[PDB]
Amino acid sequence: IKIHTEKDFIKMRAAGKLAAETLDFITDHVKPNVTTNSLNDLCHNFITSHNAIPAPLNYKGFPKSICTSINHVVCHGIPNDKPLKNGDIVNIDVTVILDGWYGDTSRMYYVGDVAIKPKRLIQVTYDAMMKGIEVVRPGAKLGDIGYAIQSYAEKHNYSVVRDYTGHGIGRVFHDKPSILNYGRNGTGLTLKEGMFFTVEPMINAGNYDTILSKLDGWTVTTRDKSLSAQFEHTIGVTKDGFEIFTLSPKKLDYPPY
Numbered sequence: 001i002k003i004h005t006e007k008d009f010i011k012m013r014a015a016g017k018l019a020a021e022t023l024d025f026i027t028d029h030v031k032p033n034v035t036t037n038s039l040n041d042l043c044h045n046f047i048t049s050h051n052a053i054p055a056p057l058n059y060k061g062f063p064k065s066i067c068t069s070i071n072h073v074v075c076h077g078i079p080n081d082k083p084l085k086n087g088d089i090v091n092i093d094v095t096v097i098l099d100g101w102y103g104d105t106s107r108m109y110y111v112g113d114v115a116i117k118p119k120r121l122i123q124v125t126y127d128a129m130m131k132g133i134e135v136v137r138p139g140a141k142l143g144d145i146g147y148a149i150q151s152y153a154e155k156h157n158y159s160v161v162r163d164y165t166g167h168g169i170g171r172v173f174h175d176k177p178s179i180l181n182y183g184r185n186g187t188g189l190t191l192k193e194g195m196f197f198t199v200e201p202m203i204n205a206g207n208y209d210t211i212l213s214k215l216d217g218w219t220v221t222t223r224d225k226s227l228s229a230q231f232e233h234t235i236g237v238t239k240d241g242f243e244i245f246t247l248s249p250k251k252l253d254y255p256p257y
């Protein structure tokens, strides 16, 4: 696990800011009848016009510049030509590379008028992410992150996806260690100043089991077809706490926006 210094923190602040600015920008474009392919092109040109690279583009063959995951899609959805429908929920997940450093962040968006139950799932997911980030400091352990997220989700009768995790990040997209979204207090490796990683819980309204698309090699869905929501931030461990690199500059942290 790589230990970074202040010079690298400066670089990660800039990459994370741009990733978060991409998500602020896309907000007003998420409407009924818009396709995820349209949203991908909007984000692509925003990213590149800011002197940066969309990390997902051809990453392990991924065919688009962002991930867009609708309703029972858990993560890694591929932008396509289907119109978004009133009542849908969508995760938009952006990663930019700026001067060689990766900024990774996602948020949930409402499409038109959304029902009470999807809105509850979204809110719980955001809150759970923040419970996880909030334990981070040198001497805390990875399992403390997972316990905080899992406890918060499960107290609301939701489940935590096990098969996909957060990750180290910096000059690499996906580095050590794996940041599990479930766990037990006081277990796992010890956090240290200078570590960078993501916190990206996926929370299901039903059971935690997921399925990977046999057809596109990427799209993950809930096995029970229940709704799933996700938020993500890129963070760093400081001398006595954490720093989030991907905060929305416009304070568009969670919907409604």
Ligand code: MET
Pocket: 056, 059, 062, 067, 075, 076, 093, 104, 200, 232
């Ligand atoms: C094809 S990019 C998959 C990236 C994943 N959504 C992440 O946040 O790491």
Ligand SMILES: [Mn+2]
Pocket: 093, 094, 095, 104, 105, 106, 232
């Ligand atoms: Mn991401």
Ligand SMILES: [Mn+2]
Pocket: 104, 166, 167, 198, 200, 232
């Ligand atoms: Mn990530």
Ligand code: NA
Pocket: 069, 070, 071, 072, 073, 074, 075, 089, 091, 227, 228, 229, 230
């Ligand atoms: Na979803």
